[PDB]
Design a protein around this motif. Structure first.
Motif, PDB file in Angstrom:
ATOM      1  N   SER A   1     -16.093  -1.296   2.076  1.00 37.22           N
ATOM      2  CA  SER A   1     -14.818  -0.591   2.091  1.00 37.22           C
ATOM      3  C   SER A   1     -13.792  -1.215   3.030  1.00 37.22           C
ATOM      4  O   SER A   1     -12.719  -0.637   3.227  1.00 37.22           O
TER       5      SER A   1
ATOM      6  N   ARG B   1     -10.739  -6.400   3.493  1.00 37.48           N
ATOM      7  CA  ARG B   1     -10.667  -7.845   3.665  1.00 37.48           C
ATOM      8  C   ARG B   1     -12.012  -8.350   4.160  1.00 37.48           C
ATOM      9  O   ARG B   1     -12.636  -7.726   5.024  1.00 37.48           O
TER      10      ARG B   1
ATOM     11  N   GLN C   1       0.831  -1.195   0.000  1.00 33.80           N
ATOM     12  CA  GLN C   1       0.000   0.000   0.000  1.00 33.80           C
ATOM     13  C   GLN C   1       0.869   1.251   0.000  1.00 33.80           C
ATOM     14  O   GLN C   1       1.770   1.392   0.832  1.00 33.80           O
TER      15      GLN C   1
ATOM     16  N   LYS D   1      -4.100  -4.953 -13.469  1.00 32.24           N
ATOM     17  CA  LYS D   1      -4.376  -4.552 -12.094  1.00 32.24           C
ATOM     18  C   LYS D   1      -5.161  -5.655 -11.397  1.00 32.24           C
ATOM     19  O   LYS D   1      -6.208  -6.081 -11.893  1.00 32.24           O
ATOM     20  N   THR D   2      -4.665  -6.105 -10.249  1.00 33.18           N
ATOM     21  CA  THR D   2      -5.361  -7.118  -9.466  1.00 33.18           C
ATOM     22  C   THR D   2      -6.462  -6.453  -8.648  1.00 33.18           C
ATOM     23  O   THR D   2      -6.180  -5.713  -7.700  1.00 33.18           O
TER      24      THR D   2
ATOM     25  N   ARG E   1      -4.275   7.023   1.904  1.00 29.63           N
ATOM     26  CA  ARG E   1      -3.885   5.864   1.115  1.00 29.63           C
ATOM     27  C   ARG E   1      -3.918   6.212  -0.368  1.00 29.63           C
ATOM     28  O   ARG E   1      -4.936   6.686  -0.880  1.00 29.63           O
ATOM     29  N   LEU E   2      -2.798   5.993  -1.043  1.00 27.90           N
ATOM     30  CA  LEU E   2      -2.712   6.072  -2.493  1.00 27.90           C
ATOM     31  C   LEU E   2      -2.954   4.676  -3.076  1.00 27.90           C
ATOM     32  O   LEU E   2      -3.522   3.806  -2.412  1.00 27.90           O
ATOM     33  N   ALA E   3      -2.568   4.463  -4.333  1.00 27.76           N
ATOM     34  CA  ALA E   3      -2.806   3.191  -5.004  1.00 27.76           C
ATOM     35  C   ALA E   3      -2.195   2.023  -4.231  1.00 27.76           C
ATOM     36  O   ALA E   3      -1.182   2.162  -3.543  1.00 27.76           O
ATOM     37  N   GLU E   4      -2.836   0.861  -4.350  1.00 24.75           N
ATOM     38  CA  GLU E   4      -2.378  -0.377  -3.735  1.00 24.75           C
ATOM     39  C   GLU E   4      -2.199  -1.450  -4.799  1.00 24.75           C
ATOM     40  O   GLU E   4      -3.004  -1.556  -5.728  1.00 24.75           O
ATOM     41  N   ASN E   5      -1.142  -2.247  -4.659  1.00 31.07           N
ATOM     42  CA  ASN E   5      -0.894  -3.401  -5.519  1.00 31.07           C
ATOM     43  C   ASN E   5      -0.977  -4.659  -4.665  1.00 31.07           C
ATOM     44  O   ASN E   5      -0.104  -4.905  -3.825  1.00 31.07           O
ATOM     45  N   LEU E   6      -2.021  -5.453  -4.879  1.00 31.33           N
ATOM     46  CA  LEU E   6      -2.184  -6.688  -4.124  1.00 31.33           C
ATOM     47  C   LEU E   6      -1.137  -7.710  -4.550  1.00 31.33           C
ATOM     48  O   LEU E   6      -0.768  -7.794  -5.722  1.00 31.33           O
TER      49      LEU E   6
ATOM     50  N   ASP F   1      -3.392  -8.446  10.251  1.00 30.77           N
ATOM     51  CA  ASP F   1      -4.047  -7.149  10.427  1.00 30.77           C
ATOM     52  C   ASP F   1      -4.661  -7.172  11.822  1.00 30.77           C
ATOM     53  O   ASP F   1      -5.748  -7.723  12.016  1.00 30.77           O
TER      54      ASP F   1
ATOM     55  N   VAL G   1       0.161 -11.161  -5.579  1.00 27.75           N
ATOM     56  CA  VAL G   1      -0.304 -12.405  -6.180  1.00 27.75           C
ATOM     57  C   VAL G   1       0.831 -13.407  -6.365  1.00 27.75           C
ATOM     58  O   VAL G   1       0.667 -14.399  -7.079  1.00 27.75           O
TER      59      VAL G   1
ATOM     60  N   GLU H   1      -9.677 -10.409  -0.610  1.00 25.60           N
ATOM     61  CA  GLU H   1      -8.981  -9.114  -0.417  1.00 25.60           C
ATOM     62  C   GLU H   1      -9.401  -8.190  -1.563  1.00 25.60           C
ATOM     63  O   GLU H   1      -9.415  -8.662  -2.704  1.00 25.60           O
ATOM     64  N   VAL H   2      -9.748  -6.936  -1.266  1.00 25.68           N
ATOM     65  CA  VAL H   2     -10.173  -5.986  -2.286  1.00 25.68           C
ATOM     66  C   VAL H   2      -9.161  -4.853  -2.326  1.00 25.68           C
ATOM     67  O   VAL H   2      -8.855  -4.257  -1.288  1.00 25.68           O
ATOM     68  N   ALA H   3      -8.639  -4.560  -3.516  1.00 26.73           N
ATOM     69  CA  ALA H   3      -7.684  -3.470  -3.661  1.00 26.73           C
ATOM     70  C   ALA H   3      -8.292  -2.167  -3.158  1.00 26.73           C
ATOM     71  O   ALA H   3      -9.418  -1.812  -3.510  1.00 26.73           O
ATOM     72  N   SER H   4      -7.537  -1.454  -2.318  1.00 26.74           N
ATOM     73  CA  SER H   4      -8.076  -0.266  -1.666  1.00 26.74           C
ATOM     74  C   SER H   4      -8.377   0.862  -2.645  1.00 26.74           C
ATOM     75  O   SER H   4      -9.238   1.696  -2.354  1.00 26.74           O
ATOM     76  N   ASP H   5      -7.700   0.907  -3.793  1.00 25.61           N
ATOM     77  CA  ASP H   5      -7.909   1.986  -4.751  1.00 25.61           C
ATOM     78  C   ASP H   5      -8.960   1.670  -5.810  1.00 25.61           C
ATOM     79  O   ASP H   5      -9.290   2.551  -6.610  1.00 25.61           O
TER      80      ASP H   5
END
Lengths: 408, 204
Positions: B192, B195, A79, B29-30, A107-112, A340, A114, B53-57
């Motif tokens: 929102s 998770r 994140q 993008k995942t 929070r800016l962009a997030e990369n999950l 978390d 994988v 899990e859901v991407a926050s953006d």
């Protein structure tokens, strides 16, 4: 610790983010921002990626739009967090040079992530006796007592890591807001501590429902179930899964059910007494100061590193203290926990904090007490003589789930 | 598009365990990741645990759940949960928790402009034909897929598909309605959290 929350909420600059621009609103009525410099920083799970400084020039009750440069877009998982802070470069009659007066985080962009975990070739070995299940992998060993149903000991080489088994915890040493005006002479039945005591939360006994060990293709699986009962009433049920893989990591999943007619518990988590006493605590989460679910607006997400003593707040009347919320990683000695969660870590057990009336009468226990919470109730404070924790911060959901990864 | 991350089968002492993981991606993008566990025991029950899990953006999703097209077409639907009428997370105060039994047609609300419809929240048990699902979920059940409802502009142009479409949701977004020309779903009813976890038991 509450002073930082007050300072953040009372700050004279308010912030709004829209894409790459920061809107700074001044809450001064008479003065221009003639002693203010805005510093921004972008970090990926705690490691800085970009930063800069922009002087503040905003009129009283005015606005200033700050256009950030093309921010980094790392392909690595995690994140992205943007943190801004207002700094006063010049000393005043009441402050030193470099004094921070306001801040905000987004929070800016997030990369999950994988990426599949590295498939190790070693397989943990399960040994089954009538007393316990023993899992061994290299120099590491785990022991699950089959009569209690809890992880009772952990070995790194020949050194024991635990002084007390890892067990569910649903209570906290009561706060002044939990206690209110209640005392042994005049009981206040409406106080949270009195409701918890009457319901038997502090005296509830865990009854083992099941404890099974299975060997998977590349891991050992432990399944446990417990019921906490008081005078024939089942207060809580905890069902867990422990998955120790070939990489040495122990993945814990917890699912708890709370009886709808019992008072909502102060916390839902685990606790243990580590044998280790380490000098510093390092975590990725909200900090640096202690924060609770209804008192965490001032805290910022980052990588924090403090001595163990700073993780204990010495309130004159001892109680639950030192919690840090929104934590994704915690490091203490050789151990690391990920997930978390909220946590506090100190030399004092919740029992000692509850039974001790003055802070100078506290004594450091052997090892270190760790409380890792999936969920924690708010602390309240609208007043200290009646229940004041708002409904959105009580643990009223009835079912709760959280996961932890324990590794070295 | 769902991309398979893992799919493993293990045999336990009294059950078979299936572990799966998927990633939903769009243009690199995942968006979502779903990790599941299927545990089929000796009693015939299939226990499903889902962690998403859901991407926050990314914008918060409308729902987080499962769906399938059953071959069965049964005459009645029986469930333990909020009812009898359709209800949604921000529109369920009138519904009462009880055992409800209605014909399948009553589980579809014929809005003139077709859309998502017929959800029942707070459900602990659902019975349809020989199947039973248990847990704590929201569901709708009808002859019309979400795709057909989305692509059809009038209710009289809808056609009943073969079998029965079931949508079982761990979580569902509110419907809003303060006005119908701007976003009106309040923050406490948007998905929102980032998770999500839910469990289902499928048996016959």
């Amino acid at each position: 610790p509450a002073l930082t929350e007050a300072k953040h909420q009372q700050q004279f600059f308010q912030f709004r983010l829209s894409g790459q621009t920061i809107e700074v609103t001044s809450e001064y009525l008479f003065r221009h921002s003639d002693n203010e410099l805005l510093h921004w920083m972008v970090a990926l799970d705690g490691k800085p990626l970009a930063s800069g400084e922009v002087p503040l020039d905003v009129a009283p009750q005015g606005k200033q739009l700050i256009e950030l440069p093309e921010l980094p877009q790392p392909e690595s998982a995690g994140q992205l967090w943007l943190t801004v802070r207002v700094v006063q470069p010049n000393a005043t009659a009441w402050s030193e040079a470099g004094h921070i007066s306001a801040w905000q985080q987004w929070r800016l962009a997030e990369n999950l992530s994988v990426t599949l975990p590295a498939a190790s070739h070693a397989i943990p070995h399960l040994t089954t006796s009538e007393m316990d299940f023993c899992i061994e992998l290299g120099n590491k060993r785990w022991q699950f007592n089959r009569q209690s149903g809890f992880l009772s000991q952990m070995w790194i080489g020949d050194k024991k890591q635990l002084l007390t088994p890892l067990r569910d915890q649903f209570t906290r040493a009561p706060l002044d807001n939990d206690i209110g005006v209640s005392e042994a002479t005049r009981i206040d039945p409406n106080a949270w501590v009195e409701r918890w005591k009457a319901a038997g939360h502090y005296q509830a006994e865990a009854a083992l429902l099941q404890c099974t060990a299975d060997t998977l293709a590349d891991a050992v699986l432990i399944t446990t179930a417990h019921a906490w009962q008081h005078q024939g009433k089942t207060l809580f049920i905890s069902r867990k899964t422990y998955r120790i893989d070939g990489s040495g990591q122990m993945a814990i999943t917890v699912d708890v059910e709370v009886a709808s007619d019992t008072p909502h518990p102060a916390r839902i988590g685990l606790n243990c007494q580590l044998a280790q006493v380490a000098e510093r605590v390092n975590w990725l989460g909200l900090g640096p100061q202690e924060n609770y679910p209804d008192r965490l607006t001032a805290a910022c997400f980052d990588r924090w590193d403090l001595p163990l003593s700073d993780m204990y707040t010495p309130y004159v009347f001892p109680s639950e203290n030192g919690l840090r919320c929104g934590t994704r990683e915690l490091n203490y000695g050789p151990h690391q926990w990920r997930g978390d969660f909220q946590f506090n870590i100190s030399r004092y057990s919740q029992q000692q904090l509850m039974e001790t009336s003055h802070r100078h009468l506290l004594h450091a226990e052997e090892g270190t007490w760790l409380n890792i919470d999936g969920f924690h109730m708010g602390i309240g404070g609208d007043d200290s003589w009646s229940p004041s924790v708002s409904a959105e911060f009580q643990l009223s959901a009835g079912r709760y789930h959280y996961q932890l990864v324990w590794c070295q």
